[PDB]
Structures are given as C-alpha cells and as structure tokens.
Design a protein around this ligand. Structure first.
Ligand code: FES
Length: 106
C-alpha cells in the first residue's frame, strides 16, 4: 500500500505498509513516529493524533465508538475525519492513503 505522511512544513514520506500493519507500525520501520507510544497503540492516547484523508477513513477499519470518545481527548483541532493512527490497519487495496500530521500531536 502506498502510504504518504503529510507533515506541517509540507514535507512527505511515502512507505509501503502491508495488510494488517498499522501506520504507526511501519512508521517505526522508516523511523517516522520515533516518539514512543502511551497506549502502546491500543487506542487510548492522543500520541498518534493525525488527520487521515477523508478518502481512506470510510474505507479502512473505522473503529467503533470506543475511539470516538478518545478522539474527544486530544489537544489539537479535531476534524470530522480525525483518527488515532495506531487504531488503523493498512491494506494493498487502499494503496495511496494520505495522512496529515499536525505540529501538536500531544
Ligand atoms: S498511539 Fe495511542 S491512541 Fe494511537
């Protein structure tokens, strides 16, 4: 799956995340999330606060309401399509997913 991460300054990182691998997982293989994780990626922290293109959010496993309550626990501007990068699984069919990461991931 083609995985691009859009930072703030406009710089991007294109990876290859296989099926079942979460963006937070491959970000550790290319050295991108190098910031440790509180919920260890178990959907329970705002460490992976990022904005996923509203084109893959309704296609990738949109977690039930358990996250919708955590999404209301970040320090950055939430978005209708906000998402906790760890609770996401990439797939070759969803190749081209664009992720937007803010300066305040908290
Ligand atoms: S890394 Fe903890 S919520 Fe995603």
């Amino acid at each position: 799956s083609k995985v691009v991460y859009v930072s703030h300054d406009g710089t991007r990182r294109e990876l290859d995340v296989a099926d079942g691998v979460s963006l937070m997982q491959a970000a550790v293989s290319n050295g991108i999330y190098d910031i440790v994780g509180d919920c260890g990626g178990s959907a329970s922290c705002a460490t992976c606060h990022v904005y996923v293109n509203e084109a893959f959010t309704d296609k990738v496993p949109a977690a039930n309401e358990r996250e919708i309550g955590m999404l209301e626990c970040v320090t950055a501007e939430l978005k209708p399509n906000s998402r906790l990068c760890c609770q996401i699984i990439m797939t070759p069919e969803l190749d081209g997913i664009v992720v937007d990461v803010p300066d305040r991931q908290w």
